[PDB]
Amino acid sequence: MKKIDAIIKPFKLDDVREALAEVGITGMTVTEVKGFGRQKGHTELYRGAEYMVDFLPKVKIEIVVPDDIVDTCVDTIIRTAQTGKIGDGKIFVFDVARVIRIRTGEEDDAAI
Amino acid sequence: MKKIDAIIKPFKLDDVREALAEVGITGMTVTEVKGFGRQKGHTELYRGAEYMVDFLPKVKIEIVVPDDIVDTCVDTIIRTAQTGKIGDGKIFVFDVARVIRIRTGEEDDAAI
Amino acid sequence: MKKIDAIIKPFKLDDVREALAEVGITGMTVTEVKGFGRQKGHTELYRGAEYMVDFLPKVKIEIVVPDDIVDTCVDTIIRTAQTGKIGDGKIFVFDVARVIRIRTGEEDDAAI
Numbered sequence: 001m002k003k004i005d006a007i008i009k010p011f012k013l014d015d016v017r018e019a020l021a022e023v024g025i026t027g028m029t030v031t032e033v034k035g036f037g038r039q040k041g042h043t044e045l046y047r048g049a050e051y052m053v054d055f056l057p058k059v060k061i062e063i064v065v066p067d068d069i070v071d072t073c074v075d076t077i078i079r080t081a082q083t084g085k086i087g088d089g090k091i092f093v094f095d096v097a098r099v100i101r102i103r104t105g106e107e108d109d110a111a112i
Numbered sequence: 113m114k115k116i117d118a119i120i121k122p123f124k125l126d127d128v129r130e131a132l133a134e135v136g137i138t139g140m141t142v143t144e145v146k147g148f149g150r151q152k153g154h155t156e157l158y159r160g161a162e163y164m165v166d167f168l169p170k171v172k173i174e175i176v177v178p179d180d181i182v183d184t185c186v187d188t189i190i191r192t193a194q195t196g197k198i199g200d201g202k203i204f205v206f207d208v209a210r211v212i213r214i215r216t217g218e219e220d221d222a223a224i
Numbered sequence: 225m226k227k228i229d230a231i232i233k234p235f236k237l238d239d240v241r242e243a244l245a246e247v248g249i250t251g252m253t254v255t256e257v258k259g260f261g262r263q264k265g266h267t268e269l270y271r272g273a274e275y276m277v278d279f280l281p282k283v284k285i286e287i288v289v290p291d292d293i294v295d296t297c298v299d300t301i302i303r304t305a306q307t308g309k310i311g312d313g314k315i316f317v318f319d320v321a322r323v324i325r326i327r328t329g330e331e332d333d334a335a336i
């Protein structure tokens with residue numbers, strides 16, 4: 001299994017959530033984060049500001065999934081979250097060593 | 113060392129926080145997230161809704177710990193956070209490559 | 225590439241954000257978390273409390289970066305976020321398997 005961390009623009013969330021619902025995905029956790037850098041009209045991180053803020057609110061999605069379906073998920077996320085403009089974000093895939101369902105105390109083969 | 117990411121039901125947090133306090137754990141960070149899918153009365157993710165929301169607020173706990181004690185922590189979390197009902201969540205263990213204490217600039221053996 | 229997760233004291237954020245801006249870093253996501261344990265005047269996690277809270281609000285920064293520059297980032301973070309007091313936090317570096325830019329559907333060599 002692999003973990004996917006996609007930090008997308010907050011308004012794509014539904015289109016993405018729905019698209020993954022179609023590809024057989026169940027279970028998703030969304031974190032609201034502060035995005036820094038890579039924004040329209042700007043070409044500077046930090047910037048100082050004083051009265052202005054330097055962040056663009058973002059949405060981080062997290063999902064662990066089998067290796068086989070990894071490419072469907074990334075291919076689908078890129079499809080539903082991409083605008084072709086600055087600020088689209090990235091997808092990072094990490095390797096999970098173990099995954100246990102709390103309700104049963106039962107583990108999943110982290111190698112599938 | 114290994115990292116444990118448990119997304120539990122928000123009301124189990126204390127029972128878990130306390131139980132890990134007993135097993136020698138120090139240091140924990142809690143993130144409040146939006147949980148999607150696997151909920152009572154529902155059998156659909158996304159769902160559309162319109163006026164209804166589709167998420168159940170969750171609590172994500174994060175802790176890095178030695179390999180030896182990994183199983184005590186998961187065994188303890190399952191014990192304190194499990195309700196035997198739908199929505200209990202999962203525990204994911206990841207491998208940490210490096211861990212540095214900011215205060216000293218001192219590193220820990222990430223292989224213990 | 226490697227992922228850096230630094231949970232610092234919330235007031236160091238700017239000094240850190242700026243320092244990384246100088247070292248060539250672009251892109252950062254900040255999550256506001258609840259920090260548990262390791263606090264001045266306290267020597268107990270959980271504590272029970274009743275009317276008191278047991279957490280200290282923290283700031284989690286996340287950045288994926290090339291392997292070569294990993295040590296500049298950790299060395300810089302320790303420099304800008306360290307107070308030499310209790311509660312400074314840690315930096316954890318994880319290995320990223322894949323990183324895709326959503327806007328182009330283009331991947332980066334996760335091995336650099």
